[PDB]
Structures are given as structure tokens and as C-alpha cells.
Amino acid sequence: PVMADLNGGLQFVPELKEFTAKLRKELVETSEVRKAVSIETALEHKVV
Amino acid sequence: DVVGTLSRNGKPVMEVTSSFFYRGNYTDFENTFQKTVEPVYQMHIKTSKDIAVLRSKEWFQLDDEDFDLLNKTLTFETETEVTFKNANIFSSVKCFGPIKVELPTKETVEIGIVDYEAGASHGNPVVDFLKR
Amino acid sequence: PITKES
Amino acid sequence: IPRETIPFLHLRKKTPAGDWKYDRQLSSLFLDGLEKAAFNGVTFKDKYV
């Protein structure tokens, strides 16, 4: 029997779950704050 | 709108307020000004996004930049002074007063200052923000 | 660089 | 426990690589538990199984 690792060295990044989850949090955080700050600077412009 | 202050022994005792109206048609907006004392606005800061939005605003100025706002309750005790260009457009808009954090004891304590200043505006964007 | 054996 | 020797009963630790290899320390903890148990007994009072 043959066993082929076709896993791009992913085995070697530790705490793969916590790390994966951090990457998603930081992307979403960056998106959310930019969308909110966008909407609010738009409204502050409109009021003025 | 007029505001008196009666003092005895160089100490305030009571405030009088009286409002007068000159019936007629008046254009002299350069002699027009209005100061209002806004209601106290409260905000529960839950998310790190909430705090990012506040730092976005020039007028939100903390004593200590690194103050941890997360899960704190801020109050905004705000006066707004305005001058008029005409019936609609304000010639200038000022909105200032202390920003306070609620402690465990329920005592509010100054941690910074609202400081907004502007020329020709159609509105006060600080009160608009705090209202919503 | 991550795929040595430490 | 002769160092170089793996006991007939042991515990294992997960390596960062992800395999479960013998761990001398945890195995000591367990084997000492057994020795204690054999001489003095173990109580399970207040254990719901």
C-alpha cells in the first residue's frame, strides 16, 4: 500500500485551528471597522 | 433667551431664566447666536469595532490614548454654541464638554473631552452621532 | 523553510 | 525504570509532529499510582460511574 502526502506542508504549522481562526477574525475585524467608519464618515459629511 | 444668577455672600443661590420675543421680520444673522446644553448621551462600548469608530472622530480626545474602552460605559456631557449665516446654514458650530467612564460604584469620572469646531455647517455631527 | 524535521 | 527501557504499561504524550510517543514522567505518575493502589488500595467513594 502507497500513502501520498499531498498536503502542502500544512502538517508543520502548529495550533492550525487557533491560527486559521485568527486569520479569519483579523480579516473580518478589518472589513467590519472599515465598513462602519465608512458609513459614519459618510453621515458626518451629510450632516455638515 | 436670558439667564440670570442671583448670588449672596459671593455664592450662587438661584438661576432666573426669561425668554423675550420681538415680533417682526429680522435679517441681521451676524447678531444671531445660540448656545444649547445638550442632554447627556450614554454609550456601552462592547466590540473593538465600536472603539475603532470613536477613534475615527477627531472630536473624541481621551486624556490617555491607551485607555481601555472595552466593556466600559461612556457618558458625553455636551454644550453646543452656534452662529448663523442665514435661517438654514450655521456660520460656525462648536460642541465641547467632558467624556466620562462609569466606575463599578456607578460614579462617572472624566477620561477625556469632546472638542468639535467648524465653519459653515448645516448641522452638528457630534449630537447626530451620539443620538444614533 | 517550515518543512525540515526540526 | 531502566532508562532506555519502555515499561509494559506506560502513558504517552503527543509530539508536535502529532505522534503519541512514550513519556517517562507521565508513565511514572501512572505506575506510582498503581504501586500505591496495590499496597494501600484506591477509594472511589463519591465517584458516579
Swiss-Prot record, chain A:
Modification after translation (UniProt): 4'-phosphopantetheine is transferred from CoA to a specific serine of the Acyl carrier domain by the C-terminal PPT domain. This modification is essential for activity because fatty acids are bound in thioester linkage to the sulfhydryl of the prosthetic group.
Modified residue annotations for Phosphoserine: S38
Highest taxon above the source species: Eukaryota
Note: Present with 17000 molecules/cell in log phase SD medium.
Family designation: Belongs to the thiolase-like superfamily. Fungal fatty acid synthetase subunit alpha family.
Subunit annotation: [Alpha(6)beta(6)] hexamers of two multifunctional subunits (alpha and beta).
Protein name: Fatty acid synthase subunit alpha
Swiss-Prot record, chain B:
Self-association and partners: [Alpha(6)beta(6)] hexamers of two multifunctional subunits (alpha and beta).
Protein name: Fatty acid synthase subunit beta
UniProt miscellaneous comment: Present with 91800 molecules/cell in log phase SD medium.
Primary gene name: FAS1
Family membership noted in the UniProt record: Belongs to the fungal fatty acid synthetase subunit beta family.
Organism expressing this protein natively: Saccharomyces cerevisiae (strain ATCC 204508 / S288c) (Baker's yeast)
Top-level taxonomic group: Eukaryota
Function text: Fatty acid synthetase catalyzes the formation of long-chain fatty acids from acetyl-CoA, malonyl-CoA and NADPH. The beta subunit contains domains for: [acyl-carrier-protein] acetyltransferase and malonyltransferase, S-acyl fatty acid synthase thioesterase, enoyl-[acyl-carrier-protein] reductase, and 3-hydroxypalmitoyl-[acyl-carrier-protein] dehydratase.
Sequence intervals crossing the membrane: none
From Swiss-Prot, chain D:
Domain of life: Eukaryota
Annotated disulfide bonds: none
Extent of the signal sequence: none
Anything else known: Present with 17000 molecules/cell in log phase SD medium.
Its biological purpose: Fatty acid synthetase catalyzes the formation of long-chain fatty acids from acetyl-CoA, malonyl-CoA and NADPH. The alpha subunit contains domains for: acyl carrier protein, 3-oxoacyl-[acyl-carrier-protein] reductase, and 3-oxoacyl-[acyl-carrier-protein] synthase. This subunit coordinates the binding of the six beta subunits to the enzyme complex.
Complex and partners: [Alpha(6)beta(6)] hexamers of two multifunctional subunits (alpha and beta).
Name of the protein this chain belongs to: Fatty acid synthase subunit alpha
